[PDB]
Amino acid sequence: VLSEGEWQLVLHVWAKVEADVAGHGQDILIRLFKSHPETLEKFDRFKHLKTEAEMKASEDLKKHGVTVLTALGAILKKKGHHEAELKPLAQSHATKHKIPIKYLEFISEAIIHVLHSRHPGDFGADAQGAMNKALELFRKDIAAKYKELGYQG
Ligand SMILES: [C-]#N
């Protein structure tokens, strides 16, 4: 359970993301695909992008990044009361896309890295700690849903 103070830190930093969801989305995804190209193989529509330049050029990837961050922000804003939001998400990622929890840890790293790169002054140790806490809660609850749906991790 995160405290109100920790959620305030998470939401405060998230407000910076909201100023440019598309920009942040591109950075986070490109980051993920570069650090872990294996995650790219999971996206049929993006598998062919060879370089970072091509990724930035992709209109579809930019649209996708918006969809991802929009969903994540809606979850974070629930401050832990996200059971209903997690259900559809857990089902498509477990059953349809087969996304191991391990990949969710990789994207969590990508998010933290980008926030650190783009907002040093607002992403100090405490803010990063609060953000890490929130993302861990997300992964914990998503993993539980995985088990219930027959995927596991
Ligand atoms: C999902 N990206």
Solved by what technique?
Answer: X-ray
- What's the CA-to-centroid distance between 138 and ligand 1, angstroms? 14
Terminal Cα-to-Cα distance of the chain (whole angstroms) = 22
- What's the CA-to-centroid distance between 31 and ligand 1, angstroms? 13
Q: What is the CA radius of gyration of the chain?
A: 15
Q: Which two tokens stand for residue 96?
A: 């349809």
Given in angstroms, what resolution was this structure solved at? 1.9
Q: Which parts are annotated binding residues for heme b? A: 93
Count how many Cα atoms sit within 13 Å of the Cα of residue 31 in the half-sphere of its side chain. 20
Angle between helices 101-118 and 21-35 (to 10 degrees): 120
CATH of the domain at 61: 1.10.490.10
Give the residue numbers spanning the domain of 36. 1-153
Count how many Cα atoms sit within 13 Å of the Cα of residue 51 in the half-sphere of its side chain. 3
Angle between helices 4-18 and 59-76 (to 10 degrees): 160
- What's the CA-to-centroid distance between 109 and ligand 1, angstroms? 14
Q: Which helix (H) or strand (E) holds 138?
A: helix 125-149
Counting the structural domains of the chain, the total is 1
